[PDB]
Structure formats: C-alpha cells, structure tokens
Write a structure and sequence with these properties.
The protein is α+β, with helices and mostly antiparallel strands. It has helices at about 25-35, 55-60, 80-85, 115-120, 120-130, 135-140, 205-215, 220-225, 245-260, 280-290; strands at about 5-10, 15, 40, 65-70, 75-80, 105-110, 160-165, 180-185, 190-195, 235-240, 295-300, 305, 310-315, 320-325. The protein has one domain (about 1-340): Sandwich (Jelly Rolls), CATH 2.60.120.650. It has ten helices and 14 strands. The structure holds N-benzyl-1-(4-fluorophenyl)methanamine, chloride ion (CL) (4 copies) and manganese (II) ion.
Length: about 350
C-alpha cells in the first residue's frame, strides 16, 4: 500500500515517496537538522521524459567543443565534439576506444559550462526547477534558502543547476574506480537522476552490477528495489557526516604515506579530490577510525540531498544523466562562514 516514507540504511536514511507533497517538510526537517542525507523517490514521474534523452542532447548541441575524462586512468581527451560522447552513451560499439582496443568509460567535463545551463537549455531549466522536492529549501527564492540573502562573510554557491553526465563502470577492475572522487561542498545540494541508460553490445552485464552493490555495503531493502520492482539503478554513493571529515583526512594521509606519496602533514586529501574509498579503504575507516557512512543506490527519479560539509563519492553502475542544484539551508549555514 502507498505510504509517506520508509527508513533505509537499517533506519539511518529517510526515504520520502511522494516528491510534491506539501507536508514533506514535517518528516524531512529533523533528519536534516541532525546532518543526515535524505533520499526522495519518484521525481522522473513529474518530468517531461522527452527533454531528458541522450539522442535529443546530441541532435540539439552535438557540434559544441568539450573535454572528456577517461574514468579508468584520469587521462583528459581534449577538444572533441560533444556528439562523440552522446552517441556512445548507450551503444557500446560507437564508443571512443583506448589504445588496448577496448571501449572507454567516459565522463563529460563541465557541460553545460560554468553557469550557462539556464541560457543554453531554458525548457529543461523550467522542467527541473518546478519539480524539485522540498521547494522552500531548494528553489532559488525558497523561504528556507539563504543563498540570495547572505553577505560576503559567507561563501555563496554559483547559479545552477549543473549537469553530470558519464558512462557506467563495467569490469571487476572498475569496482575500485570513482565516477566522482571523494570531496565536499560548503553549500547543501539536491542531485536528481533524470535518465539511466542500460546498454547493448556488451549487453548482458547484470552480474558485476549486483556484486558492486553488495560489496558496496547496500542494505537488504535497497536490494529488493532491483529483484522485486525492476527499477533502473543508476549510481552507488557513499556519504559521510560532516563531523567525520577530519578522521577521513587522517586515514588518507596515512595511506598516502604507505603508498610512498610525499605530502606535508597538513595537506588536505579531501580537497584534492584524488581518492575513491574502495571496499578495503571503507573497512579500514570503520575498523581503525570508528567512522560509519551511508551507502546509497540512486535509481531513476531519485533525488539525493547532500548536507553541506559532508564528504561524498559517486560510482556509476550504468550510464547516468544527473542534474544538481545548490542551496544554503539555515540548518547548515555554519559550513560556508569565512571566520573561526
Ligand atoms: F505528509 C505526507 C502525507 C502523505 C504522503 C503520501 N501521499 C500519497 C503517495 C504515496 C506515495 C507516492 C505517491 C503518493 C506523503 C507525505
Ligand atoms: Cl552540520
Ligand atoms: Cl531546453
Ligand atoms: Cl518545503
Ligand atoms: Cl572527480
Ligand atoms: Mn558534490
């Protein structure tokens, strides 16, 4: 039967079911005040599905010049047409190949560039912004979004939203690689999965995706969304409380030293955005430092709420289109203050 919400991560993660409900804030606000992430399902059912297809982005914008990243080795592929990314999103035999002859796993960098989403894509901007959950927090003019109301003593977010486009990771070796490495933001954010592409060519790739979710520490209810309801899983997240950020820096300074990096004792491995916590490192963080995170599978139409200051990483299971908006809630404004 239909319900307002459920508890994931064995009780530690709120999942809201009705993205537009006017009373969602009554359930959300205490979890948010405690510094927890929140998941909201069902946003895809509110959107115009024809605006969020890979083939439309290629047809409309394909002659723009862009840079890509090879997710396996961090190599930059400079100054290529954006159709060269989009046309291989779901069709493996169209993908750019590495020198070994394999199809690459690619991430589209900074596209649309800087703050240009609204100017380049006005109909997509309207469709996203009118359907964001918790609109008093997330809309540019929301009553609980302080972004437009703070003086220069606070770091203010850029004008959004921002699009995040990347292929899925495929192989056993790929399990230890990030799509987006461990980092933190000084603003809050909402990240919406607007499209999931499950390919054809090397099409029959189900088994390595189940092993990735299981070794990723996903809970038993999360496993039921696949097996029972056949929803499309897009990306595996790990998120850590803002209060645990320095203990994570201590672990990564120790591992950098073990691997023969030569780093000053104060250097910031989270700001460097150079690490992905694999199963080995996640277990060492728990056992050696006492730190537990949230392992979250973001399915089509899921919105992930990321608290300001919370370290987080993303690993795509299939090809993903995500759209994110930054905001400044009163609950977490301390994280963007420029003093003490
Ligand atoms: F405060 C609230 C009271 C009720 C709700 C649930 N509304 C019905 C519904 C359930 C699931 C998906 C879509 C619609 C949500 C919040
Ligand atoms: Cl906080
Ligand atoms: Cl548009
Ligand atoms: Cl709200
Ligand atoms: Cl990254
Ligand atoms: Mn982020």
């Amino acid at each position: 039967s239909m319900t307002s919400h459920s508890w994931l991560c064995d009780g530690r993660l709120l999942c809201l079911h009705d993205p537009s409900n006017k009373n969602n804030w009554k359930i959300f606000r205490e979890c948010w005040k405690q510094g927890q992430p929140v998941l909201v399902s069902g946003v895809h059912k509110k959107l115009k599905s024809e605006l969020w297809k890979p083939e439309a982005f290629s047809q409309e914008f394909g002659d723009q010049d862009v840079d890509l990243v090879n997710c396996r080795n961090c190599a930059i592929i400079s100054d290529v047409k954006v159709r060269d990314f989009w046309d291989g999103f779901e069709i493996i035999c169209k993908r750019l190949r590495s020198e070994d002859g394999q199809p690459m796993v690619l991430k589209l960098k900074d596209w649309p560039p800087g703050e240009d989403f609204r100017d380049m894509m006005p109909t997509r901007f309207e469709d996203l912004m009118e359907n964001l959950p918790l609109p008093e927090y997330t809309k540019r003019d929301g009553r609980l979004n302080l972004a437009s109301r703070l003086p220069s003593y606070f770091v203010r977010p850029d004008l959004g939203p921002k699009m995040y486009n990347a292929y899925g990771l495929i192989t056993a070796e790929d399990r230890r690689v990030g799509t987006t490495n461990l980092h933190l933001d000084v603003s809050d954010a909402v990240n919406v999965m607007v499209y999931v592409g499950i390919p054809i060519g090397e099409g029959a790739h189900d088994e390595e995706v189940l092993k990735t979710i299981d070794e990723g520490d996903a809970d038993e209810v999360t496993k039921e969304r696949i097996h029972d309801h056949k929803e499309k899983p897009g990306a595996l997240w790990h998120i850590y409380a803002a209060k645990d950020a320095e203990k994570i820096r201590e672990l990564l300074r120790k591992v950098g030293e073990e691997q023969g990096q030569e780093n000053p004792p104060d250097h910031d491995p989270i700001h460097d955005q150079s690490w992905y916590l694999d199963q080995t490192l996640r277990k060492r963080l728990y056992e050696e430092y006492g730190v537990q995170g949230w392992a979250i599978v973001q399915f089509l139409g899921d919105a992930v709420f990321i608290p300001a200051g919370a370290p987080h990483q993303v690993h795509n299971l299939y090809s993903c289109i995500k759209v994110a908006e930054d905001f400044v809630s009163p609950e977490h404004v301390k994280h963007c203050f420029r003093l003490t």
